[PDB]
Design an enzyme around this catalytic site. Structure first.
Site, PDB file in Angstrom:
ATOM      1  N   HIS A 114      -9.343   1.014  -1.271  1.00  0.00           N
ATOM      2  CA  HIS A 114     -10.187   0.145  -0.456  1.00  0.00           C
ATOM      3  C   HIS A 114     -11.632   0.620  -0.382  1.00  0.00           C
ATOM      4  O   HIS A 114     -12.495  -0.141   0.067  1.00  0.00           O
ATOM      5  CB  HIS A 114      -9.630   0.031   0.966  1.00  0.00           C
ATOM      6  CG  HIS A 114      -8.342  -0.721   1.050  1.00  0.00           C
ATOM      7  ND1 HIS A 114      -8.205  -2.013   0.592  1.00  0.00           N
ATOM      8  CD2 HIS A 114      -7.132  -0.365   1.540  1.00  0.00           C
ATOM      9  CE1 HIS A 114      -6.966  -2.421   0.793  1.00  0.00           C
ATOM     10  NE2 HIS A 114      -6.294  -1.441   1.368  1.00  0.00           N
ATOM     11  N   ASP A 136       3.677   0.716   0.051  1.00  0.00           N
ATOM     12  CA  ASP A 136       3.820  -0.113   1.237  1.00  0.00           C
ATOM     13  C   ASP A 136       4.368  -1.502   0.936  1.00  0.00           C
ATOM     14  O   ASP A 136       4.557  -2.289   1.868  1.00  0.00           O
ATOM     15  CB  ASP A 136       2.488  -0.213   2.000  1.00  0.00           C
ATOM     16  CG  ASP A 136       1.279  -0.321   1.094  1.00  0.00           C
ATOM     17  OD1 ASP A 136       1.433  -0.534  -0.130  1.00  0.00           O
ATOM     18  OD2 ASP A 136       0.155  -0.188   1.628  1.00  0.00           O
ATOM     19  N   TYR A 145       3.881   3.715   4.223  1.00  0.00           N
ATOM     20  CA  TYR A 145       3.887   4.284   5.565  1.00  0.00           C
ATOM     21  C   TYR A 145       5.261   4.524   6.169  1.00  0.00           C
ATOM     22  O   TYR A 145       5.336   5.082   7.271  1.00  0.00           O
ATOM     23  CB  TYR A 145       3.052   3.393   6.494  1.00  0.00           C
ATOM     24  CG  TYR A 145       1.702   3.182   5.880  1.00  0.00           C
ATOM     25  CD1 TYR A 145       0.752   4.195   5.906  1.00  0.00           C
ATOM     26  CD2 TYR A 145       1.404   2.014   5.188  1.00  0.00           C
ATOM     27  CE1 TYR A 145      -0.475   4.038   5.307  1.00  0.00           C
ATOM     28  CE2 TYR A 145       0.180   1.846   4.583  1.00  0.00           C
ATOM     29  CZ  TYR A 145      -0.755   2.866   4.645  1.00  0.00           C
ATOM     30  OH  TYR A 145      -1.983   2.716   4.051  1.00  0.00           O
ATOM     31  N   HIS A 188      -1.510  -4.029  -0.700  1.00  0.00           N
ATOM     32  CA  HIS A 188      -2.817  -4.586  -0.383  1.00  0.00           C
ATOM     33  C   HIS A 188      -3.692  -4.648  -1.626  1.00  0.00           C
ATOM     34  O   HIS A 188      -3.566  -3.832  -2.541  1.00  0.00           O
ATOM     35  CB  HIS A 188      -3.524  -3.760   0.694  1.00  0.00           C
ATOM     36  CG  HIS A 188      -2.719  -3.572   1.940  1.00  0.00           C
ATOM     37  ND1 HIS A 188      -1.976  -2.436   2.184  1.00  0.00           N
ATOM     38  CD2 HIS A 188      -2.541  -4.375   3.016  1.00  0.00           C
ATOM     39  CE1 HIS A 188      -1.369  -2.552   3.352  1.00  0.00           C
ATOM     40  NE2 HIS A 188      -1.698  -3.719   3.878  1.00  0.00           N
ATOM     41  N   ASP A 224       0.130  -1.080  -4.836  1.00  0.00           N
ATOM     42  CA  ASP A 224       0.031  -1.082  -3.384  1.00  0.00           C
ATOM     43  C   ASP A 224       0.089  -2.522  -2.888  1.00  0.00           C
ATOM     44  O   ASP A 224      -0.365  -3.444  -3.569  1.00  0.00           O
ATOM     45  CB  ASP A 224      -1.278  -0.400  -2.966  1.00  0.00           C
ATOM     46  CG  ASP A 224      -1.403  -0.211  -1.472  1.00  0.00           C
ATOM     47  OD1 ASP A 224      -1.617  -1.207  -0.752  1.00  0.00           O
ATOM     48  OD2 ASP A 224      -1.298   0.947  -1.009  1.00  0.00           O
TER      49      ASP A 224
HETATM   50  O1  LIG Z   1      -2.216   0.495   3.315  1.00  0.00           O
HETATM   51  C1  LIG Z   1      -3.369   0.086   3.370  1.00  0.00           C
HETATM   52  N1  LIG Z   1      -4.096  -0.131   2.148  1.00  0.00           N
HETATM   53  O2  LIG Z   1      -3.591   0.086   0.904  1.00  0.00           O
HETATM   54  C2  LIG Z   1      -4.097  -0.221   4.842  1.00  0.00           C
HETATM   55  C3  LIG Z   1      -5.338  -0.179   5.222  1.00  0.00           C
HETATM   56  C4  LIG Z   1      -5.665  -0.932   6.546  1.00  0.00           C
HETATM   57  C5  LIG Z   1      -4.300  -1.544   6.939  1.00  0.00           C
HETATM   58  C6  LIG Z   1      -3.317  -1.175   5.786  1.00  0.00           C
HETATM   59  K   LIG Z   2      -2.463  -3.895  -5.049  1.00  0.00           K
HETATM   60 ZN   LIG Z   3      -1.737  -0.606   1.174  1.00  0.00          ZN
END
Ligand SMILES: O=C(NO)C1=CCCC1
Ligand SMILES: [K+]
Ligand SMILES: [Zn+2]
Ligand SMILES: [K+]
Length: 357
Positions: free
Chosen positions: A133, A264, A304, A173, A171
């Site tokens: 991120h 996740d 997580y 996200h 991932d």
């Molecule tokens: O696992 C993540 N990113 O890969 C998270 C960042 C903010 C909420 C979840």
């Molecule tokens: K991804």
């Molecule tokens: Zn994630």
């Protein structure tokens, strides 16, 4: 036929001093490491040392302003740390955060170097804080510096500038930082699978949709596979790899594969809401091992549920070591929206990849 592994307990020092139960826990990496020991996978790997990334290395992807701000947090008081973290989207900072982010990146640099020089065939990096991120100019979503993006650029710096690097981000996200860093780049192919929900899932941007195919020289080299309206699992991820990830990747012919391996999307995760199994992650890893003459680096991102991520990443390392894939459960028919998503990506990227036609 050697698999590398990097883990350093110093990366546990990054912590949340106001919410000690925040899900991005120090013990995420120690639990993964412990499970490798329990399954007797650790003694089968060659241990690769951690190191600090240098500031020059960070500048491969990040602005000097961003580097200086995170660097300055090492000497901040808790009041400064609290206010600074609240300036970002979903960030906590402690006096050790900068050092830990440097160690995460430097660990992956050493692993990429071991792969590219032939010391090891492939490698796994049990690192935190995560990276995908993180943007050129800001921290975001528990990430300070974009470890995977930095490793791609570091790899090019020790081989040749145009080394073809594939980044597969599974991932749950979207790796917004990784997409943006390489959006105009045709030497780094970014492929992300992610829960999207029409933009109603972190990081909450339509940048993650399938029609974002890259910009300029990078048109065609950004592949977003967004999931909508469904608890996705092994059948959907296997279908995406069969129809999209592997045909595109084979045509790109990468010389190095980096996996932004968040776990996740795993069954049991408190945030992702998906049900990819450890055997599923094993099969995804095994398929990527057929690329780049087996030169694969698996980098921990999110994930997580401590038990879920420990079993899932250990199964990936088992694949890297040459173990046979475990058996998937009977693959149910795809959720109808997953078929829609895959077909949308196929139409978006068939112009650029003849293997999809
Ligand atoms: O696992 C993540 N990113 O890969 C998270 C960042 C903010 C909420 C979840
Ligand atoms: K991804
Ligand atoms: Zn994630
Ligand atoms: K790209």
């Amino acid at each position: 036929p050697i698999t590398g592994l990097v883990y350093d307990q110093r990366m546990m020092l990054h912590h949340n001093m106001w919410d000690s139960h925040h899900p991005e826990l120090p013990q995420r990496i120690s639990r993964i490491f412990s499970r490798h020991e329990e399954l007797r996978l650790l003694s089968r790997c060659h241990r690769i040392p951690a190191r600090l990334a240098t500031e020059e290395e960070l500048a491969l992807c990040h602005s000097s302003k961003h580097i200086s701000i995170i660097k300055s947090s090492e000497h901040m008081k808790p009041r400064d740390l609290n206010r600074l973290g609240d300036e970002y989207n979903s960030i906590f900072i402690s006096n050790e955060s900068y050092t830990c982010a440097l160690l995460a990146a430097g660990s992956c640099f050493n692993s990429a170097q071991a792969i590219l020089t032939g010391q090891v065939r492939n490698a796994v990096a049990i690192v935190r804080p995560p990276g995908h991120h993180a943007e050129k100019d800001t921290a975001c979503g528990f990430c300070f510096f974009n470890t995977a993006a930095l490793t791609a650029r570091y790899a090019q710096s020790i081989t040749r500038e145009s080394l073809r690097v594939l980044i597969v981000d599974w991932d749950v996200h979207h790796g917004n930082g990784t997409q943006h860093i390489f959006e105009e780049d045709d030497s780094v192919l970014y492929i992300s699978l992610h829960r999207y929900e029409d933009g109603a899932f972190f990081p909450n941007s339509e940048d993650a949709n399938y029609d974002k195919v890259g910009l300029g020289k990078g048109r065609g080299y950004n592949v977003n596979i967004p999931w909508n309206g469904g608890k996705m699992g092994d059948p959907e991820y296997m279908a995406a790899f069969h129809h999209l990830v592997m045909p595109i990747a084979r045509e790109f012919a990468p010389e190095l594969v980096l996996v932004s391996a968040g776990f996740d999307a795993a069954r049991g995760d408190p945030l992702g809401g998906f049900q990819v199994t450890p055997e599923g992650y094993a099969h995804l890893t095994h398929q990527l091992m057929s690329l780049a003459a087996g030169r694969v680096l698996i980098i921990l991102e999110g994930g997580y549920n401590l038990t879920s991520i420990s079993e899932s990443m250990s199964m990936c390392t088992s694949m890297l070591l040459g173990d046979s894939p475990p058996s998937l459960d009977h693959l149910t028919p795809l959720k109808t929206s997953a078929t829609v998503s895959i077909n949308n990506v196929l139409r978006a990227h068939a112009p650029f990849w003849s293997s999809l036609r």
